[PDB]
Design a protein around this ligand. Structure first.
Ligand code: HEC
Ligand code: HEC
Ligand code: HEC
Ligand code: HEC
Ligand code: HEC
Ligand code: HEC
Ligand code: FES
Ligand code: FES
Lengths: 181, 423, 235, 423, 235, 181
C-alpha cells in the first residue's frame, strides 16, 4: 500500500541514518586508553609535617597535607551548623556527617585522626586548584577563579562552591606510604 | 523600484556566451549595484570590516597550521618555532591573535548600531537570528583557539568553561567527558579543539552568505524609520563605487591603527601567563579568561546568594535549580533575550533618533556593557558583587520590560519622510 | 630616572654591545641554575642582536653540556643547531626563554635582581634557606609581617634565588665599570632578546605599513570627496 | 518550457513570511523540481554517488583529525591509537581510505559516461572545465593524504611526485624546496600536507556548487542528441521523487558493496609496505604509488629514448627539453587535451549511440585506460615499454586527431527525434 | 592442505585458546629479540582475543623490562598502561606489531617459521652468521646459486634470524602436543591479533550493514517500480 | 584628474595587496632551522672493506663503499664513450671527465684512489634510493622506482636517470674518518 510502503521506506532510512550517526558521537567519548584510571602509591616519607604535599593522578592533583595544631583546633571547633556542605564528601566511608573525626583520615593503621588529611585539590565550583599554605578568610584554601573560601578540613565556605573538597578512597601502607585508588 | 538592471548581457559575444553560467549576472545585478540610501553615516562600514577580518583570520590560520603541532609536548615549541624561525612568524601570530580582538570589537559596534536604528525590527528578523547564530559560533571558535598554545591560561580557561556544562544535573558530567575526551583536559581536548577551530570559520562564511543574501533581499536599514520608497527612486544611489570607496577608506584607517598596534602594542591585550607552559598542579592568580567574554563571566559569577536581591534563595524552592545552574541559565538567557528582541519591542516605530527615552535607556545599556567588561576582571569581593548584580539586572530589565513600555508610550517625535534628506 | 632601555619606544634596535655584556654574564652566572631551551645557539649570529663570530659560537657550543641525541642514544658534541641546555631541579629555577614576556617585563628583572637587601625590622631572623627580595611578589611572608587579614606589610617577599652578584663579579673586555646595576640592565636586555629577537623587524614593518596605508587612505579620501561632490555642494 | 513553478508562496502564512529569505523558493523551484528527461539509463546516478562520497570523506576526516597528530614521531602512533583505542576507529579509517578509491572509480564512470553521450559538446563546456579543475584538486588532495600516515610508501611517493616539479629547468629546485619546506621531506612537508589536505575539500564543494548551478541552467545531457524541446513538454518528468528514488536505490547497492569490502576486503586496495615505519635510508621494491595515478605515472615513465618511435631524440634539438621535462609535459598534456576536447570534436552531432566509428574508437580508449592502469605497476623492462608507448600514443591520437576526422565523415546514422521515446 | 586459520573467512572470531598458546610462545621465545611497542598490555583483557585475568596481566607487566618515565627520569615498575617493550639492535629484529599486515599475511609467518632446512646442494658451506630459509624472499643469495642474470635459483633466501624452535621447546598447560607446527600456527594467530584486534567487530558490523542496506535497497526498488508504473505499462 | 587619481588609487591598492601576499608565499620556504645544513664526521673504522656503508645527513643518505677488485676493473675498463654523463658530478673538483681516477675519491692523505668511493645515494631521476650490494645489469646499483642502472663508479646507465651519482665535498681525517661537508 501507498502509505505503508512510503512510510516504511522513510523509517528504514531514518534508522540507518541514526545507526551511522551514533558512532560519530561515540568516538568523542573516553577511549580505552583513558578507561584505565587506576591507583598511585605516594610516600609521605618525612616531608616536614605541616606544610603540604601534592601529587598528580588521574590528571588532577591529590593534596596530602599534615595538620598544624592551630589549624586542627579551628577545625574541631566547627559545629555542623553554619556549614554549607555537611556530607563529608570522603568516599572511603558512608554519608556520615562532615565531622573532623570522620573527615580527617584513617589512622596510619593506628588510632589517631587529627594529623593527616588527603583530599582531591579540585574546587567543586568548576574544577580550579585552590591555593594552599594557609590562605583565605578561614585559615585554609582559597580558590582564585571566583573566590571560594575553604576551611581547615576542606569544607566549603564563603563562596559559590556548593560542596567541600572530596576525599578519595585511600588507606595506609604501615606508617610510611599512601595508597590512592 | 528595486532596479536590478541585469545588464541584459548586451555587452558583446563574451557577455553572451556567459549565458551558460550566469555568474557575472549575479554579481552585477545584485551584489554590486544594490541601491543603498544616501543617508548612511559612518556606522554602516563595520560589515566590510568584519568580512575582511574574517578573511584575514582564515588566511593567517591556514598559514599557522603549517607549523603548529597539536600535542601537549609540541605545541608551545611549535609556536616558538613560528615566532623565531619562520619568515613572517610573529606577524602571522600577532595578526591572528589581535585580529580576533578587532573582530569582536567590530561585531560589538555592528550590533549596537543595530539596536539603535531598529535593524532588528521587522522586516529584518532573519538577519538578526543569523547574526546571533554567528556570534555564538565565533565565540566558540575563539575559545577553542585560545587553548591551542597550551600555555597556562589556556588550560584553566578550558577547565572552567567546560565545568559549566557539568554544572547542570543528570547530563552534566556525561557531556563534560564527551567534550573533553576524558575526565579532565589533555591532548584529546587539544585535537578536538584544533579540528573544530580549523572547521567552523567556513560555516561562518556560509552563514555570512545567508547574512548577505537576507539584507540584499531586505533593504539596508538607513538612519531613518523609512524605506527606499519603491514605486523612480531618485534616492538610493548604488553601492559601487560610492559606498565601496567610503568603506574602503574607513577600512584603510582601521588597518592602519591595527598594524600600529601589532607593531608597537601587540602583547597589550594578552595575558602574560600564557607565555609559561602549563602545570595542571598549580593555578595562577586572576585567570581572567579574556576581554570578549567578561560580560557573561560576570553575569555567571554574580548570582551567588550574597545579596538581599539574591533570587537564588528563592529559586532553591526546586531542589534542582542550584546557584551554578542558575548562573548558566542567566548567561544563556542574556543571549537568548537579545535574540528575542524583535518580538519584544512592541513599537510601530523605528530608529531611536526619534525616541528620546529609548536614547537614554540605550546609552545606559552601553555603559552597562562597559561596566560588565570591567567587572569580570575584578574579584567577587564587596562592592563589585552589588555592581555586577545591578548591571545584569539592568540588562535583563531593558531587554524584557523596557522596550514594551516604550512601544506603548514613546511617540513624542515628528518622524521624517522623504528619505532624500537634502538638508 | 626609570632607566629606560634603548628598545623602549618606536625605535631602539637592541644596542648590541649591551647584549654581548649580558651574554658574558648569563653564561658565567645565570647559566649555573637557569636555562633557555627555547633558544637555539645559532641565533648568536643572526642579525638584530649579538652578531658574534660563528666560529666562536661553535666553540662555545662544544664547550657546553652534552645533549645526547634523538635517534641513537649517545652523548654527542652538542652542535649549535641544538638548543641551550636546561637546568630543571634540585636547587634550580625556571626557563628564561620568555620570562621577559611572562611578567613592563625587563624592568621587572632589573628591579628584581636589583633588591635583595637584608631582612627588615619586622622579622630580622628571616627564614632558613629562603632569602628576601624587594620586588618579587609571589613569595611567602612570615606571619610577623602579615596584617590582620593575611596581606603582607612588606614591599616584596621571600624568593628562593640567592643574590646573584656582588660588587665586581666579572670583567668586561670592552672596558666598562662592571657594577651590579650595569650587569642587571645588560642581562635584562639579553633576556628580552632571547624572548623577542625579531623586534627591529617588527618596528620597520610597522613604519612601512603605517606609511603605505596612510598614503592609500589619503588617496581614497580624495576619491570619496570627488565622487560625493555633486551631492554635497548646494548645502 | 523550463517550468520553474516557483510555488508562488501561496501555501500559508509560514510560506508568506518566508519572503524575507527566499531559501525554500530556491530549493523547490530549482533544485528539486528540475525537469529531467525520461530517457535516463543507469549511468546518470554516479553524480549522487560522488556527492555522498564527498560528504562521507569530509565527515570521516573531521573525525580522524581529532586523533591524528601531524609529526614524524607521532603520526604512525596516532593512527594505531585510532585503529585500537578509539570507538569506531578502524571503521573511520577504512571508510576514509577505501571511499577515496570509490570516489575515483565513480568519477572515472562519470567522465567516460560523458565522453560517450557528448556531454562535453556545446552548450556544456563550463561543466567540463569545472570538472577537470575538480579532478585536479581531488588528485592533489588524495596525494597529500596518502602521506599523512608516515608509512614507507608515503615518503617515497612524495619524494618522486615532488622531484617532478624539480625536473623542469631554472625554476625546478626552487619550487621543490618551496613545496617540501626544505631540500627533502620532513615534518614541514607533513604539516603543509595536513593543512592543505584538511582545506581543499571545501573548495571542491564550492566548485561542486558551480558544477550543479551550470547543469541546472544547462539541461542534463539525455541518452540522445536532443533537448527537452522547450516551447508544454509532456516529456521531462521532474527530479523528485522519481530520479531521487532511482539514484538512492543505486546508491544503497553501492554502499552495500562498499561496506562488504570495508568489512572483508579492506586491506586489498592498499600497499602493505605502508604499515612499516619510514626509513629515509632504505627504499622498498615496487613503490607503485597508487591505482588512480598509474595511467599518468606510466605516461611519464614511458618516454625514455628506448624505441624507434622515441621522440626524445628529436626533442633534444633544443638542449633544454630533456626526457624528464618531456614526460612531465606529456602528462600535463594528457589532461589538458581531455579538457580541450569540446573544441576539438568538429561534429554537429551528439551521443555516439549514432556514430559507430566513434563507438569503436571509444571502446579502444577504455581498453587503453585499463592497460595503462595495469602497466604503471610493472617494471620498465621489455615488452612493457612498447605497450606503454603505444597506449599513450593512442590516448593523444584519439583526443587530437580522431575526433576531427569523425566530425568530418561520421554521419551514417538516423538521429532520433521526440525525446519522448515511447518504444 | 593450506592449513587455513579460524578467522580466514566471513566468520571465525579468533579462537582464544590458540591465542593463549601463542602468548606462551611469544613471551618465552620471540620476545628475546622482537618487540611490539604498538601493543598495550591491557589488551590482554579486552574482549575478542585472550580474555586473560587482569591480575595476571599486572603481574606479567611488572615482571618485564623497565620503561622509565615521560615526566621524571626514573625506572618505574612498568604498569600495564604502558606498551610492550622494544628490542632494537645488536642482534635484534623488527617490531611484530603489524607484521601480519606488512606482508596472505599470517601464512607468511607460518611458512617462514616453518622452513629453515639445511643448505641445499648448490652451496652446502652456506654463510657465516647467516642462516637459510625456504620462504623469505628479501635475503642475499650466494653467486653459486644465482642464474646468468642475477636471479636466484633457490625458493627462498638467507635470513638473519636463527631457527626459533626445536621439536618440543615448551609445554602447554591445557594439554596439547607442542610440536613446531602447532606453535607456529598459534604464534601467527597471536600476531594477527596484535595487528587486527577489532576483527570480530568488523565482521559483525559488516553483517548488520549488509542486512540493513539490502532491506533499504529492496524497499527503494519497490517504491521505484511503483512510481514508474504508469509510464512502463503499455510497452 | 579623473584618470590619474582613479588609476593611482588602483595602483596603490595593488601594491599593498602584493606586499601582503608575498609573505604568505615566503613562509613556505626553508626556515632558519632548515638553513643550518652543516657537516658530519663518519668513521670508516674497519667495516669490512668491500660491502657498503650508509649514513644519514641533510635528510639524505651518504654512501661510503669500499672497492672490490672485480668492481674496480669493471670501472677502470669503461671508456668515456657510451657513458651517458661524463661530467664526474663530484663537487670536490672541477668538471673534469667522469673518469675513475678522478671519480673514486681522495687518497686517505696518501696516494691511491681505487679503494673508496663516497657518493650521494640519491637517484638523479627523481631522488629515490638505489639498492646496493652488487645489483642491476652492470654490477653496481639499481633504482627500483623506475629502473635506472648505475655502474661500479656510480655513473648512470640503462635508464631515464640523466646523470650519475654526485659526490659531495669530502676529505680524509688521516686514515680513519670521513668529513662530509
Ligand atoms: C641558583 C644559584 C640561581 C642562579 C645562580 C640564578 N638563579 Fe634565578 N632563580 C633561581 C631559583 C631557585 C628561582 C625561583 C625563585 C622562587 O622563589 O620561585 C629563580 C628565579 C628567577 C627569576 C623569576 C622570578 C619570578 O618572579 O618568578 C628570574 C627573573 C631570575 N631568577 C633571574 C636570574 C638571573 C638574571 C640570574 C643571573 C644573573 C639568575 N637568576 C641566577 C635560581 C638561580
Ligand atoms: C633472535 C635470536 C631472534 C628471535 C629469538 C626471533 N627472531 Fe624473528 N628475526 C630476527 C632477526 C635478526 C630478523 C631479521 C631477518 C632479516 O634477514 O632481516 C627477524 C625477522 C623476523 C620476521 C620478518 C621476516 C621478514 O620477511 O622480514 C618475522 C616474521 C619473524 N622474525 C618472526 C619471529 C617469531 C614468530 C619469533 C618467535 C617464534 C622470532 N621471530 C624469534 C631475530 C629473532
Ligand atoms: C586555518 C586555521 C585557523 C583558522 C581558520 C583560524 N585560526 Fe585561530 N588559531 C589557529 C592556530 C594554528 C592557532 C594557534 C597558534 C596561535 O596561537 O597563533 C590559533 C589560535 C587562536 C587564538 C589564540 C591566539 C594565541 O596566540 O593565543 C585565538 C584567539 C583564535 N585562534 C581565534 C580565531 C578566530 C576567532 C578565528 C575565526 C573566526 C580563527 N582563529 C581562525 C588557526 C586558525
Ligand atoms: C547579532 C547580530 C549580527 C552579527 C553578529 C553580524 N551581523 Fe551583519 N548585520 C546585522 C544587521 C541587523 C544588519 C542590518 C541589515 C539591514 O540593515 O538590512 C547587518 C548588516 C550587515 C551588512 C550590510 C550593512 C552593514 O551594516 O554593513 C554587512 C556587510 C554585514 N552585516 C556583515 C556581517 C559579517 C561579515 C558578520 C560576521 C562575520 C556580521 N555581519 C555579523 C546583524 C549582525
Ligand atoms: C577533515 C579532515 C579530512 C578530510 C576533509 C579528508 N581527509 Fe583524507 N585524511 C585525513 C586524515 C587525518 C588522514 C590520516 C589518517 C588516515 O590515513 O586515515 C587522511 C588520509 C587520507 C588518505 C590515506 C589513507 C591511509 O590510511 O593511508 C587518503 C587516500 C585520503 N586521506 C584522501 C582523501 C580525499 C580524496 C579526501 C576528499 C576529497 C579526503 N581525504 C578528505 C583527514 C581528512
Ligand atoms: C571532468 C569531468 C567531471 C568531473 C570530474 C565531475 N563532473 Fe559531474 N558532470 C560532468 C558532466 C559533463 C556532466 C553532465 C552535465 C549535463 O548533462 O548537463 C555532469 C553532471 C553531473 C551531475 C548531474 C547529472 C549526473 O551525471 O549525475 C551531478 C549531480 C554531478 N555531475 C556531480 C558531480 C560531483 C559531486 C563531482 C565531484 C565530486 C563531479 N560531478 C565531478 C563533468 C564532471
Ligand atoms: S572554580 Fe573554584 S571557585 Fe569558581
Ligand atoms: S627515481 Fe631513481 S630512477 Fe626514477
Amino acid at each position: 500500500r501507498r502509505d505503508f510502503l512510503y512510510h516504511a521506506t522513510a523509517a528504514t532510512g531514518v534508522v540507518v541514518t541514526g545507526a551511522a550517526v551514533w558512532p560519530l558521537i561515540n568516538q568523542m567519548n573516553a577511549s580505552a586508553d583513558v578507561k584505565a584510571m587506576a591507583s598511585i602509591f605516594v610516600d609521605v616519607s618525612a616531608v616536614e609535617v605541616g606544610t603540604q604535599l601534592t601529587v598528580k593522578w588521574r590528571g588532577k592533583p591529590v593534596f596530602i597535607r599534615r595538620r598544624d595544631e592551630k589549624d586542627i583546633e579551628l577545625a574541631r571547633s566547627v559545629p555542623l551548623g553554619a556549614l554549607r556542605d555537611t556530607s563529608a564528601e570522603n568516599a572511603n566511608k558512608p554519608g556520615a556527617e562532615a565531622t573532623d573525626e570522620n573527615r580527617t583520615l584513617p589512622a596510619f593503621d593506628g588510632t589517631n585522626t587529627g594529623e593527616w588529611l588527603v583530599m582531591l585539590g579540585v574546587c567543586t565550583h568548576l574544577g580550579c586548584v585552590p591555593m594552599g599554605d594557609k590562605s583565605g578568610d578561614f585559615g585554609g584554601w582559597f580558590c582564585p577563579c571566583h573566590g571560594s573560601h575553604y576551611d581547615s578540613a576542606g569544607r566549603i565556605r564563603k563562596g559559590p562552591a556548593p560542596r567541600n573538597l572530596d576525599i578519595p578512597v585511600a588507606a595506609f601502607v604501615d606508617e610510611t606510604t599512601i595508597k590512592l585508588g | 523600484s528595486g532596479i536590478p538592471h541585469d545588464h541584459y548581457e548586451p555587452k558583446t559575444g563574451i557577455e553572451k556566451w556567459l549565458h551558460d553560467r550566469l555568474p557575472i549576472v549575479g554579481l552585477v545585478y545584485d551584489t554590486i549595484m544594490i541601491p543603498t540610501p544616501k543617508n548612511l553615516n559612518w556606522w554602516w562600514i563595520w560589515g566590510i570590516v568584519l568580512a575582511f577580518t574574517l578573511v584575514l583570520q582564515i588566511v593567517t590560520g591556514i598559514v599557522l597550521a603549517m607549523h603548529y603541532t597539536p600535542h601537549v609536548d609540541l605545541a608551545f615549541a611549535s609556536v616558538e618555532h613560528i615566532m623565531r624561525d619562520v619568515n613572517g612568524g610573529w606577524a602571522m601570530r600577532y595578526i591572528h591573535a589581535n585580529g580576533a580582538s578587532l573582530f569582536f570589537l567590530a561585531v560589538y559596534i555592528h550590533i549596537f548600531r543595530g539596536l539603535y536604528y531598529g535593524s532588528y525590527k521587522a522586516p529584518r528578523e532573519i538577519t538578526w537570528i543569523v547574526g546571533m547564530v554567528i556570534y555564538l559560533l565565533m565565540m566558540g571558535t575563539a575559545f577553542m583557539g585560545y587553548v591551542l598554545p597550551w600555555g597556562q591560561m589556556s588550560f584553566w580557561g578550558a577547565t572552567v568553561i567546560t565545568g559549566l556544562f557539568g554544572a547542570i544535573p543528570g547530563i552534566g558530567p556525561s557531556i563534560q567527558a564527551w567534550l573533553l575526551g576524558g575526565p579532565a583536559v589533555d591532548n584529546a581536548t587539544l585535537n578536538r579543539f584544533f579540528s573544530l577551530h580549523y572547521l567552523l570559520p567556513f560555516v561562518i562564511a556560509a552563514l555570512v552568505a545567508i547574512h548577505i543574501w537576507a539584507f540584499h533581499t531586505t533593504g539596508n536599514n538607513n538612519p531613518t524609520g523609512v524605506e527606499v520608497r519603491r514605486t523612480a527612486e531618485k534616492d538610493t544611489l548604488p553601492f559601487w563605487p560610492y559606498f565601496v570607496i567610503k568603506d574602503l577608506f574607513a577600512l584603510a584607517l582601521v588597518l592602519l591603527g591595527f598594524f600600529a598596534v601589532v607593531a608597537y602594542m601587540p602583547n597589550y591585550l594578552g595575558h602574560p601567563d600564557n607565555y609559561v607552559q602549563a602545570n595542571p598542579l598549580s593555578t595562577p592568580a586572576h585567570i581572567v579568561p579574556e576581554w570578549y567574554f567578561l560580560p557573561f563571566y560576570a553575569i555567571l559569577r554574580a548570582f551567588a546568594a550574597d545579596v538581599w536581591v539574591v533570587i537564588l534563595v528563592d529559586g532553591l524552592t526546586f531542589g534542582i535549580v542550584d546557584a551554578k545552574f542558575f548562573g548558566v541559565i542567566a548567561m544563556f538567557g542574556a543571549i537568548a533575550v537579545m535574540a528575542l528582541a524583535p518580538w519584544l519591542d512592541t513599537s510601530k516605530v523605528r530608529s531611536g533618533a526619534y525616541r528620546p527615552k529609548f536614547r537614554m535607556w540605550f546609552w545606559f545599556l552601553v555603559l552597562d556593557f562597559v561596566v560588565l567588561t570591567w567587572v569580570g576582571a575584578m574579584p567577587t569581593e564587596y562592592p563589585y558583587d552589588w555592581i555586577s548584580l545591578i548591571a545584569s539586572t539592568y540588562w535583563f530589565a531593558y531587554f524584557l520590560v523596557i522596550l514594551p513600555l516604550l512601544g506603548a508610550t514613546e511617540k513624542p517625535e515628528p518622524i521624517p519622510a522623504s528619505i532624500e534628506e537634502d538638508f | 630616572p626609570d632607566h629606560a632601555f634603548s628598545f623602549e619606544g618606536i625605535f631602539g634596535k637592541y644596542d648590541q654591545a649591551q647584549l654581548r655584556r649580558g651574554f658574558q654574564v648569563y653564561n658565567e652566572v645565570c647559566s649555573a641554575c637557569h636555562g633557555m631551551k627555547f633558544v637555539p645557539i645559532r641565533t648568536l649570529a643572526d642579525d638584530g642582536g649579538p652578531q658574534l663570530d660563528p666560529t666562536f659560537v661553535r666553540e662555545y657550543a662544544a664547550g657546553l653540556d652534552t645533549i645526547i641525541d634523538k635517534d641513537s642514544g649517545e652523548e654527542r658534541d652538542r652542535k649549535e643547531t641544538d638548543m641551550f641546555p636546561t637546568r630543571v631541579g634540585d636547587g634550580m629555577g625556571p626557563d628564561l626563554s620568555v620570562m621577559a614576556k611572562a611578567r613592563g617585563g625587563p624592568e621587572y628583572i632589573y628591579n628584581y635582581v636589583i633588591g635583595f637587601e637584608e631582612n627588615p625590622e619586622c622579622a630580622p631572623e628571616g627564614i632558613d634557606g629562603y632569602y628576601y627580595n624587594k620586588t618579587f611578589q609571589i613569595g611567602g611572608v612570615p606571619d610577623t609581617c602579615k596584617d590582620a587579614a593575611g596581606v603582607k606589610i612588606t614591599h616584596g617577599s621571600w624568593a628562593r634565588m640567592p643574590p646573584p652578584l656582588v660588587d665586581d663579579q666579572v670583567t668586561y673586555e670592552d672596558g666598562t665599570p662592571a657594577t651590579v646595576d650595569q650587569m642587571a640592565q645588560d642581562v635584562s636586555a639579553f633576556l628580552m632578546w632571547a624572548a623577542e629577537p625579531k623586534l627591529v623587524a617588527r618596528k620597520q614593518m610597522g613604519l612601512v605599513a603605517m606609511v603605505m596605508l596612510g598614503l592609500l587612505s589619503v588617496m581614497l579620501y580624495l576619491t570619496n570627496k570627488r565622487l560625493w561632490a555633486p551631492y554635497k555642494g548646494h548645502k
